């Protein structure tokens, strides 16, 4: 996350961190329930074996409150393509259930039609992660959050050198130096509505990070609500 600010304890409790063989974070996820994490398909190519850490507030020290869970099943969208990053979605089923507690709680999945008419028409959402704090920079040891304006589809297509499909949306700023970045993929974009946070996006791709005239691109969760539901029935 470029710009933004550190999550306070309890403020981003749905964040998960995908950790590689050397226990280093490389992507985020969103806690959906005790057994399921939402993430980006493209993250699956970035470590050959990985686990999920919940409750972390500082990656370079064990503070208490962290827990690591092994993955039982990865469920990847079969239409994911690196040509365009379309269908950038996966779900992880954990081997052992998460114990909800301070700093560890699920984000809500919204109802699909209401999400499109009410959530997506809010001014802003919140993106979070442990990823790079500047383009080509270093990952954050602290969990960061950032408020990102929704950007209309026409403006985003005008801004973008690459196709924006119906499975994507755009959020962030034209020139203000705030955006998600590498290492944030898979993590939550949530929209607050009447004091409840709903999953609306997955950090997916972008041209640089916080680049002038470019936005952050997110998997549109509303397009995959039925898919997500089915992913918990394999």
């Amino acid at each position: 996350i470029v710009g933004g600010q550190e999550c306070k304890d309890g403020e981003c409790p749905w964040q998960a961190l995908l950790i590689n063989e050397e226990n280093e974070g490389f992507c985020g996820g969103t806690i959906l329930s005790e057994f399921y994490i939402l993430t980006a398909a493209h993250c699956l190519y970035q470590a050959k074996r990985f686990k999920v850490r919940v409750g972390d507030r500082n990656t370079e020290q064990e503070e208490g409150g962290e827990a690591v869970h092994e993955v039982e099943v990865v469920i990847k969208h079969n239409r994911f393509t690196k040509e365009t990053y379309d269908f950038d979605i996966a779900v992880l089923r954990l081997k052992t259930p998460i114990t909800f507690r301070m700093n560890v709680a699920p984000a809500c999945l919204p109802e699909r039609d209401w999400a499109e008419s009410t959530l997506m028409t809010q001014k802003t959402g919140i993106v979070s992660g442990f990823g790079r704090t500047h383009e080509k920079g270093r990952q954050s040891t602290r969990l960061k959050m950032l408020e990102v304006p929704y950007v209309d589809r026409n403006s985003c297509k005008l801004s973008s050198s690459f196709i924006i499909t119906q499975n994507m949306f755009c959020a962030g700023y034209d020139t203000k130096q705030e955006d998600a970045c590498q290492g944030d993929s898979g993590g939550p974009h949530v929209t607050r509505f009447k004091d409840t946070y709903f999953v609306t996006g997955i950090v997916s791709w972008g041209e640089g990070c916080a680049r002038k005239g470019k936005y952050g691109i997110y998997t549109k969760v509303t397009a995959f609500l039925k898919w997500i539901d089915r992913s918990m029935k394999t």
């Binding site: 079969n78 239409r79 039925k226 898919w227 089915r230």
Partner: peptide, 4 residues
């Protein structure tokens, strides 16, 4: 399907 188209959503598999």
């Amino acid at each position: 399907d188209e959503d598999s």
